[model samples]
Target: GLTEAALIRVKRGVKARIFISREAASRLEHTVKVKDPAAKVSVVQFELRQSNSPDLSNWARFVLVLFPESDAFTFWLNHGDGISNRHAEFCNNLLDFMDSRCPDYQTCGPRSGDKPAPTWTNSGLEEKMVIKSVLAKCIRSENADMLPVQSDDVFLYSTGMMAIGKIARAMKDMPGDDTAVIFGWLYSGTLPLVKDSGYSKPILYGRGTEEELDKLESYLAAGGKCTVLFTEITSNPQLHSPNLVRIKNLADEYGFTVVVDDTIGTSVNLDILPYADVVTTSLTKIFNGACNAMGGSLIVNPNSRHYRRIHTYLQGHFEDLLFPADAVVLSENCIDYPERVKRCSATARAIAHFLAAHPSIDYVNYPTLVPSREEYERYRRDGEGYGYLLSIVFREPDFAVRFFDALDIWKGPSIGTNSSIALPYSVLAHVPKHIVRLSVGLESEAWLRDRVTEALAKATP
Candidate 1:
């Protein structure tokens, strides 16, 4: 009786697999035909067998192919695409090629498709490769190897709050050696998470003025050990331009790590990674180019001691990125980042120029317009042109409200999207009621200018 029931269940499973594979193959063929006319594509067919027991678990059997004259190959797995012996063989071949091409680089760990179980101290090479790829893409330098290479465990946290909890637990593991500093509003939530852990006190640098430098010097004089200095490239709301080169010099002088949050100026917009020991970003914003997903990344300098430490610490809590989400981010709407930044900055400059001359506008706070300021020159040298976010002080408190309400564009909290957005600084920035924050989105320069002009013209006397 038991044998008959098992056979029936297996038969049903096989039928389901056959149906799925057929449908998937049809869809894939159609997609390829529409997407690439020159390239020949095929969906290989296969069947389950007892010898391929490991591969036959869910939807048993896998399709294989041999592409002629194409160095690049793509795979579409319907289901049950996990580590298997067949996969292992494929990976071994790929590794052989990699080793031959990159002999100087270390060649260790399981092949990508290998089904071998990993040890307690080592991670699956596939997972490590994903982490390394993310770091390389975001960090943009040869120093990506400075971070952790492998881990035995990986964890996924739902929210930024939960992610911080994982980070805190990791920091507690390091105890005395663990320390961090945060730089910008984006890190406002992360700083407390680090502090709550049993690590050393973190140093926060919030200002770019001489007066703030004096306070920093005094803090150092009091024997403060700043292991890292954290801040945003262009701070939220205020958009204060920090003198990064000067800060890097200070970090070198004091033997501290310079950590920059390039959220506002995404890596593609501003390449500040070379100067900083590490860079962090909220990829949910401009990098993803879509508001559909939320994720953050920490990129390390390959030369930094903390690189490997932070990577290892992050292992247990690192989320296995969603394939569909990655597809959307990496393929569909992956921004022409440099062009987006340049366009946004150019539009922002136009708006700022217009606002600066407005009779109703009292003051404009933008780095490029800040005449004779040391930070302005430093910003120029760093190649971080005046970013897209700017704040304007209206002639009167009511004027600010009127101007914001009069705009036809979307009014939202975040920036770097394709639509222009406007927010009253009093609400978003927590500034005086007369201040307004404007995030120059990717809207047409002329359209934004017309909206601003219309809003200003409608402002009541």
Candidate 2:
């Protein structure tokens, strides 16, 4: 049993690649050795992205893989990327997908003949190219007026965090050690990404509001320096949109990079390129709405003042790390993305309205209903609905769990599923009690409404 102090010491050793615990690490290593004696194993711990989710040790079981010399571990360590934690998970999932596709292939060791061991190298390259092309087209179709984009401008990576990691790496090399800024409460891992990527510990403006932006301005006015500003179009759980226009103006004055994640507010719903020097999307979410594949994209705004430098850096260094199996699956899942966005957005809007009017609900956080409605609407494409995600707080604290239990829909953490998904947000994200987050899917509006209405009736005392 490692104490907190012992774990901290061991974690440093792991970072240095000098210590693999003989007791715990050796047990896992032994298991891998039994299958392939030449393979090496190491543990990389991640800060849990959700409170109610699986921990590092639990994920270790799923991380079974044969070590390659130039694996993600080396890629991350050498490139100053803290995103390797998620990349490891993505690699494992890619192997599973590949293994399922060709079960007869040897799981470990030398291949029997000309066949390589079932891995991403031998996966279909054409499939990867097709998804990249389609994703670039998706971005262009939605944002052509704001900034021109081509397939060549799109760079795909293993995960969303990796896309961000790449940006951090590029920015780290760009002549500054100043702090980065997290403009809103983002996913749990992002703050660590900023810290682990060799930048100064970042400044977090917890709420992306005008008041906060004003404070940021004051900091800059007093000779503060920044390397990059990372913000989500609408933040997770809170679903608030930062004023991108104001942020862009700040960037223009301050000469820092602006990177925006449009995962929640998909390109189908918003045109955000004009305000950001770099736009990153987690193709793992709505872009791969089936929720079976993992991927991410980074697109540089060609019109950005920093475009030439940033774009050229990426062009020289980018690798097609997205596995073909995952790419193929994502491509197939996203063929109907436009329609799915419309349907999901409509369903989410309906549920948000319903929740807002319900006696048992205290507050709803959806793009249209949030305090940042005007800011969000400023970038929303014509006729597009709010989005496919919403969060609600129950008036009675005890009612949330009761309502969640009675709602009787698919319950899970991952969002942007083609089928409806719900989770106790307070429990998962460590927010205030009785908050529930819902990702509306392709379910008919009437069916979801009935489920919500019945659950509210049952939960209300």
Candidate 3:
């Protein structure tokens, strides 16, 4: 077994012998080796160190050890991206041998993994696919569909925003002009972010509203491309779910694909694939159930008519952007993901009901209480969840401010963690009203409720 001291000595000793120290928290070593009559080759050893970037504030990313053995490469980008002792040194020498014998065969991307991950032979300068299979494993583990069809279909990205952005770019492959729809206020979500993401401005629609969705028939009648329909299972803050089955049927008739964000609904709690052609989510939330690490994922339904096309588009366009450090964080923390969701989901339900009964509360925005309660129930399986996120609307604007200021739970952006977060979100400039978005966590319901009651007592009184 390689001891910690031994690993550091090897890393530092090897570093001094070959390359000058660079800034990337990780290290990559290259060498050349010969086998008598056998061909010489080039080598590369990837060290798992923190990549120096604003995005990587504290944690480091994983390291993939690559060998210049073939045009196609397969290397292990194991956990503990940096500072972890690695046992694969022979391949590093082997990669160098190939590079020495035939430099053109496997040209090194950069001297180190710290540099921006290289471009593929096909795609431009984008991140490389590191631990792609492992990352996919972590994602697919969350879904208990028990149904096997084609291969496990998912795309991994550095940020939830990037995953959504990639999907926006890929939707251009649809047979139409650049156009899409945004339902409702998009209520504390990313629907509005699509304009800058790659698609044209949106046509606002209602959540599962046949008539509001009917507006689509004429919008397409104007003779334009209906790129896609983007929606959430339940709109954040508003907590109103669109009629997914109805929307999918409309999508079928209108010749547009349906894209959904299930981060709030959570894959463990809901089966969104039947209604959505593509589903993107931010695992940074509950998947880790921790507040620190950042991560995102994209799931493409294999059963969709456009599956192949979507697959090709993403494969061609997607980059290896997920940092190993974050993946490591998720891998360790997400072992009890379903339990975390269940606890938070249960707490959210309790909190929502508590708010609904309180005299001072104006209204409670939760999926079960909304007009489309049945829609949310349609896909929700047992052991899953209705949703863990919700927003509270106070009867008075100043009361909303008072409640936020008085609450004791951690208040911040980003949701789904072991710790509860409450944000004094500004939902609209037009209405000029304040909203409190409570991201329910695994905290005990009684404890969370006590904090809320105390805050409300102080504010409403």
- The lowest-lDDT stretch of 10 consecutive residues in candidate 3 is 72-81
Q: Deviation in angstroms for 390 in model 1?
A: 1.7
Q: Tens-digit lDDT track for model 1 on 1-461?
A: 22222223223211111112343344334434555565544333333322223322223223322122321111212221222232333333333122111112222222323433311112233433453355355445434544432222223222223334344455457435534555534414455445544445665554445466567767666766666566667676556656677667767766666666676755554556557765655544565455544444555465554656766767644543322223233334444655666677778888888889988877787755653244544434244456677878877888878888888888876666667776665344213466677778788888898998898878766
lDDT leader: 2
Q: TM-score each candidate.
A: 0.61, 0.76, 0.67
Off by over 4 Å in 2: 1-123, 141-147
Task: Please give the TM-score that candidate 1 achieves against the real structure.
Answer: 0.61
Give the range where candidate 1 is weakest over 10 consecutive residues by summed lDDT: 96-105
What lDDT tens digits, residue by residue, belong to model 2 across residues 57-87? 2221222222323222233222322223334
Clashes of 3: 24
lDDT of each: 0.51, 0.69, 0.60
Candidate 3: regions farther than 4 A off = 1-152, 173-175, 185-193, 206-208, 221-224, 426-432
Model 1 misplacement above 4 A: 1-172, 175-188, 195-208, 321-327, 370-385, 429-431
What does candidate 1 score in Cα RMSD to the true structure? 16.8
